[PDB]
Every structure is written in structure tokens, then in C-alpha cells.
Amino acid sequence: AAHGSNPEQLKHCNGILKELLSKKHAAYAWPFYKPVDASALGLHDYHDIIKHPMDLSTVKRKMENRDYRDAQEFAADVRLMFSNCYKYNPPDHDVVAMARKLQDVFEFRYAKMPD
């Protein structure tokens, strides 16, 4: 059910998304900007391990297309992106450290969502 507050909450989500894509966080956000090109990266097992790829450009397209109906649906995709990283890579890999830092940005600001 659409709630009166869903548009306002989606504006907060869009703010978060813009922040995740901003220069401020680019040092650690960059691996998440675009879909993983598994072939290009030689990760020939990526799509056997990751059933539901997700990345920030896809989240942006879904936001622009009004695909997300509520904040929880948005959050689920952003968290799916991080989970994919945690699933595929050894936990000591630099990309996992970058994921944890970007997820910290996400979770702390998501927690400030108006309600």
C-alpha cells in the first residue's frame, strides 16, 4: 500500500543515492558504479555465484523510472549490492573493505530517514 509519506521517504532515498554517487565517496564507491562486467574482469564464476547482480547505476535507473514504490524496496537493492560483494569475494579483499565503508555511509544515513 502506498503511504502518504512514501514520496518524501523516496526523496531521502534519492538523496542517499546521490551521496553514494558523489565525489565525496568516490575513493571507495567506484567498484559499485556500474554492473560488474564479469568477462572483462576475468570473473568467470561471477554469475554462477551471484544470482541477482545489482549496482548503483541500476538503482539510479530504477529510481528515475519510479520503479521503487517505497524506501524499503530501495534499501533492499542497495543492500543486495553489498551482499553480492560479501558473497563473491574473500573477506580480506580490498573491494570488501570498500563495500563496508560505503555500506556504513548508506546505513547511517538510511537510519535518519524521516517518518
Residue number, nearest CB to ligand LDR: 31
Pick one of 56, 78, 85, 102: the residue that binds ligand LDR (CB under 6 A).
Answer: 85
Write down the least CB distance from residue 86 to ligand LDR, Å. Answer: 8
Please say whether the beta carbons of 105 and 18 come within 8 A. Answer: no
By CB under 6 A, tell whether 95 contacts ligand LDR: yes
- Tell me the one-letter amino acid at 20: L
Alpha helices in 1-115 (DSSP H): 6-20, 26-29, 38-41, 46-49, 56-64, 71-88, 94-110
Determine the interface stretch with ligand LDR among 2-10, 68-76, 81-89, 103-111 (rule: CB under 6 A). Answer: 81-89
By CB under 6 A, tell whether 88 contacts ligand LDR: yes
Nearest to 101 by CA among 18, 24, 11: 24
Please report, as residue ranges, which positions from 35 to 64 form the binding site for ligand LDR (by CB under 6 A).
36, 41
C-alpha dihedral (100, 103, 108, 113), degrees to nearest 10: -170
Write down the least CB distance from residue 87 to ligand LDR, Å. Answer: 8
Interface with ligand LDR by CB under 6 A: which residues? 31-32, 36, 41, 85, 88-89, 95
